[PDB]
């Protein structure tokens, strides 16, 4: 029902930075929380950062301080500023969103690589 368009991935040098962005389609009242999980070398994907429509954020421990998530007041779009990137941050970063009925939507993901 909802589509999540992602962009901003690619390759970066250690210590460098990247800005991800995720824009939701559908009704503006059909998405509350948005954020990013990232793929692990194993099976699971870990929480990077997410934010509610009201601005309430939560970060995964391993990115605290270095990563900052923000939201555009108007469009349902979030921004992830990833600073001081390390090789251990190489992963596919999946955007996601939660409906006001606790339905999860996921994007295709964007490869991020830190040399």
Among 21, 25, 32, 68, binds other proteins (CB under 8 A): 32
**Tokens linked to 30:** 């059909």
Among 6, 9, 21, 46, binds other proteins (CB under 8 A): 46
User: Positive or negative, the Cα torsion across 27, 3, 62, 8?
Assistant: negative
How far the first Cα of the chain sits from its last, in Å, is 37
| Closest alpha carbon to 53 in 80, 41, 35 | 35
Own/partner pairs, 55-64, CB within 8 angstroms, 24+ separation: 62/88, 63/89
Pick the closer one to other proteins by CB: 58 or 66. Answer: 58
Pick the closer one to other proteins by CB: 72 or 104. Answer: 104
- How many chain residues bind other proteins (CB under 8 A)? 24
* Helix (H) or strand (E) run with residue 57 in it: strand 57-59
**Residues in 71-110 that interact with other proteins by CB under 8 A:** 98-104, 106
Among 41, 42, 65, 87, binds other proteins (CB under 8 A): 42
Site membership for other proteins, residue 25 (CB under 8 A): no
Contact set with other proteins (CB under 8 A): 31-33, 37, 42-47, 50, 52-54, 56, 58, 98-104, 106
């Amino acid at each position: 029902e909802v589509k999540l368009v992602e962009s901003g991935g690619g390759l970066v040098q250690p210590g460098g930075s990247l800005r991800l962005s995720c824009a939701a389609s559908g009704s503006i009242f059909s998405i509350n929380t948005m954020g990013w999980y990232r793929q692990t070398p194993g099976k699971q994907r870990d929480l990077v950062a997410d934010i509610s429509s009201g601005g309430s954020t939560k970060y995964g421990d391993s990115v605290k301080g270095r990563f900052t998530i923000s939201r555009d007041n108007t469009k349902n779009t979030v921004y992830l500023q990833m600073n001081s990137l390390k090789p251990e941050d190489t992963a596919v970063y999946y955007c996601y969103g939660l409906s006001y009925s606790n339905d999860d939507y996921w994007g295709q993901g964007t490869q991020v690589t830190v040399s």
